[PDB]
Amino acid sequence: DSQSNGLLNKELFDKVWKRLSCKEKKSGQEILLNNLVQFYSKDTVEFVEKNIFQKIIEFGWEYYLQNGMFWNCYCRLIYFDTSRSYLDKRQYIVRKIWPQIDKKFAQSVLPSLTEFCESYFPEEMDTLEEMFT
Amino acid sequence: VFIGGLSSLVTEDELRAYFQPFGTIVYVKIPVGKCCGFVQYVDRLSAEAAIAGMQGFPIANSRVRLSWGRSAKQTALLQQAMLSNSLQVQQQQPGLQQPNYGYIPSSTCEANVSSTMLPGCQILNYSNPQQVIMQGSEAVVNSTNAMLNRLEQGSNGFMFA
Amino acid sequence: ALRGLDTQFLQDNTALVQAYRGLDWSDISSLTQMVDVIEQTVVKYGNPNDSIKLALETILWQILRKYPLLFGFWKRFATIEYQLFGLKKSIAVLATSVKWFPTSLELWCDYLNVLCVNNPNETDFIRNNFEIAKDLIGKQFLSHPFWDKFIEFEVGQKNWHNVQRIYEYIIEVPLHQYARFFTSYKKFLNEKNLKTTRNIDIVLRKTQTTVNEIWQFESKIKQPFFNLGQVLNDDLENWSRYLYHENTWMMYIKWLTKKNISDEVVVDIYQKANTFLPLDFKTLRYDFLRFLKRKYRSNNTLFNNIFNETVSRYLKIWPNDILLMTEYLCMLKRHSFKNSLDQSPKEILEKQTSFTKILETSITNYINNQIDAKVHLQTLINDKNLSIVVVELIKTTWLVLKNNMQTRKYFNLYQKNILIKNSVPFWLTYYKFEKSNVNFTKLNKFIRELGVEIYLPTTVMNDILTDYKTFYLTHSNIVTYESSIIDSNTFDPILYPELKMSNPKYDPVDWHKKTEWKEAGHIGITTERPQISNSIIECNSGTLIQKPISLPNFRNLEKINQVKINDLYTEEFLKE
């Protein structure tokens, strides 16, 4: 759909990943994630999910995992996909994403994640509260 | 700044959100029911940018008339002098104590600094309420960071202002 | 709310009933309705409540004395004066007497007995049970008085071992251990009790409050947590409350949450603080709202009803607050319309569409002014809080039902309505909707209209322009950009957001009758300036030499000493 690939270009995406990889020495991490989220299409969402969200998952960088804004941006990436249906995205967020975060990190992640939940999933707001207490 | 013609549906935080970007604000208050409010900036420059910027802008469907006004205690003194009709004398609002070198007027900060104090940079600023904090390079991050917060959170309804 | 003038009015009403020397039933009803309005307007501390109780008791008003003492003991927690007065009233009664007086005895035992100034209550209860032939009941209340930290525990203990000639120390070790424990407790307590009595005196200052003293004494009651504090800190905090302060209630609720006592106690203290605290505090009361949200998961039925009563009271007293409606709608869709992922998707979709229907009929009934008192939402909804109900409808249609045409239809419909046209969450949702589609035509038309037709806070307009610049640069190209430019408006999506960043009434498209000229150096103060009409200071001297210079024409010489000032602050505010 002529969706111009902004930060998903091999010249620019390498700069963005090279700044994301420094994790606390650099300054502007959440702004950079929060602009990488904004693609809203199935092909674009899949690339952004695989390259910065799955990869910072599997590297286990503790800065990003304890940070609430990382998980909030990932949920907001998936939820605003124009491709996925409602049951699909609610299924994905509650069933796939939210188990992955550690329970030691709950005191750091639950302020932001609640703020997602009450904004969009009031029905599942028990589940979240049950998962982390 | 005396803002007059307020719509009685507008709160103090909603009016702070209007008059925030013109400068750092010492205090914002709205008299109960009196259909007018006051905004006290730190600088004269900021206040004149406010009166030029928001003059007749409709804050909640009513056009707004901006002018110079006095404070709260000074207003109480003028009303008690207006009953007794005795003198009605005002006194002058305090000045900063010139010269100040760090301060660049009409400049705002939102939230370990090793500043070299070279001139283009902004060595000093007033903390938002009140204290004096040194601006850094990092603050242009923080404002942007907070900006995305009220684009998201205030969209859903968690701050109307 | 001239409460001293009300006290004089009540005093003159009582004095005119007393100086008419009859019943004065017109004046009695005037004084009684005055005391009713005074209690419903002000705190009713123990002196006026006791005076109204004395006047009513002399007017043979036994049941009405029982009720006004009930709302009076509601509006003095340390009222062992009113308890003792109530106990005397309780002592003389009919058939339900020996229960109802003893019910009030155990009530004052629950409400006042743990303070050092409670000894007349236990003495009166001992006198009542000693008037009865229940020596076991008097000895049981005596076993209660030995275990409590009071002032005169020693006199009570000696009177206990002297009054009980028949059964003094049948359990000696327990009685002496309780007496020595209460004596150590009174020894530790007498430090801060004496620090209180060496500061407490009405001298019109913080010493009248004993505020530092009462705060340090209560902080001493915070740390020594031997759970008698669960009775005693109330015996502290009520003694702190008699002479309302919000930080006291927050400390009290915080410590009761730390001890993990049963939630009905914490709800009771919350309802007491919700009644007694004056308006516009907003800080304990939002904390009670967030308390209900946390404790909801345990009970799921009782807390929803408390929450709805509370939010209704709040939207009546704080109608311009917007956050109450969002909290109401989230608790509404979390309780009343419960999904989960277990169920079949045909069942999950139905709850969402029913939520859409109650939202849309609620707004459609409010716009046409037809309030269905059956639906509680339409009772709550408001011309401040309407747009956020609309935003929940938009957000549910676009994101859950995934129905774009009905969403776009709703934006076109409710864009025009006066109540919600200048609304922040409506237009930030419009911005996220048109941002999720990529399209730039609606977004460029939006950031053009943010000054002229759309009136938002300057902070919100600054945010929309900065984020749309970052979005436009990252997501569009030079072809789309150079097509977006037409020079009849001089709109361009990269530079125009920068130029109009803080100027809300920016548009790009004889200059001495303008008010920018007339108050140029001095803002607010407008003066016509003398000026030369034909002025040659633009002309260079090489061209001025060519032909002879005309004489000057002038303008406004007469007005150099008249300056005029549009004093809105004196007229509209002081003169009102």
Side-chain angles (χ1 to χ4, degrees), chain C residues 145 156 174 179 224 229 244-245 247-257 259-271 273-294 296-312 314-384 386-404:
Chain C
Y244 54 86
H245 185 272
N247 201 359
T248 302
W249 293 99
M250 292 185 76
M251 188 174 179
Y252 187 78
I253 288 294
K254 177 176 175 291
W255 178 239
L256 267 61
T257 303
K259 296 183 286 194
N260 197 0
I261 320 166
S262 68
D263 294 338
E264 193 69 28
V265 183
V266 184
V267 170
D268 284 334
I269 303 297
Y270 263 145
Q271 297 294 99
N274 194 2
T275 300
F276 294 150
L277 270 292
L279 306 178
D280 207 78
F281 274 138
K282 293 189 182 182
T283 305
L284 195 276
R285 294 177 179 175
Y286 280 153
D287 198 3
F288 168 62
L289 212 61
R290 293 187 290 112
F291 173 76
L292 296 174
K293 288 174 72 174
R294 293 190 179 102
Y296 174 83
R297 196 186 72 254
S298 67
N299 202 357
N300 201 353
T301 307
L302 146 88
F303 286 108
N304 188 13
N305 292 325
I306 296 174
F307 190 83
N308 293 324
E309 293 287 325
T310 297
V311 172
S312 297
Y314 291 176
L315 283 167
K316 296 298 176 290
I317 67 162
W318 292 334
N320 286 326
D321 208 274
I322 193 62
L323 191 276
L324 282 317
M325 182 57 68
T326 74
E327 293 290 327
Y328 181 74
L329 285 168
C330 87
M331 180 51 68
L332 176 66
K333 203 256 180 66
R334 179 247 271 263
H335 182 273
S336 289
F337 297 153
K338 273 183 256 73
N339 295 117
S340 181
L341 269 309
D342 298 330
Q343 304 175 3
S344 75
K346 183 173 71 177
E347 291 175 356
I348 296 170
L349 192 281
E350 180 61 32
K351 309 292 281 184
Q352 304 295 326
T353 310
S354 68
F355 186 60
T356 296
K357 296 294 106 183
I358 176 173
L359 268 287
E360 179 171 354
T361 63
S362 299
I363 167 179
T364 314
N365 286 326
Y366 182 77
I367 295 300
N368 300 117
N369 201 1
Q370 305 173 358
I371 293 298
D372 186 359
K374 270 83 176 63
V375 180
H376 184 66
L377 184 66
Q378 315 181 12
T379 297
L380 294 176
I381 200 169
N382 191 357
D383 56 350
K384 182 75 175 176
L386 198 166
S387 65
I388 198 144
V389 166
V390 190
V391 162
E392 292 291 329
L393 181 64
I394 300 295
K395 190 163 77 173
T396 309
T397 294
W398 159 50
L399 288 176
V400 173
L401 293 180
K402 205 174 175 65
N403 188 352
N404 286 114

Side-chain angles (χ1 to χ4, degrees), chain A residues 6-7 35 38-40 79-82 84 86-87 90 95 118-120 122 125-126 129 133, chain C residues 293-294 297 330 333-334 339 341-342 348 352 395 398-400 402 432 435-436 470-471 474-475:
Chain A
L7 297 179
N35 280 295
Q38 291 179 355
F39 279 102
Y40 319 109
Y79 189 75
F80 283 88
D81 190 358
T82 64
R84 286 177 164 87
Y86 171 65
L87 280 309
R90 186 170 186 255
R95 294 288 175 82
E118 295 183 352
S119 299
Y120 303 102
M125 183 55 212
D126 288 337
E129 189 173 3
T133 63
Chain C
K293 288 174 72 174
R294 293 190 179 102
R297 196 186 72 254
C330 87
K333 203 256 180 66
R334 179 247 271 263
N339 295 117
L341 269 309
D342 298 330
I348 296 170
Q352 304 295 326
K395 190 163 77 173
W398 159 50
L399 288 176
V400 173
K402 205 174 175 65
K432 295 198 293 180
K435 191 200 283 184
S436 80
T470 305
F471 181 80
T474 311
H475 287 85

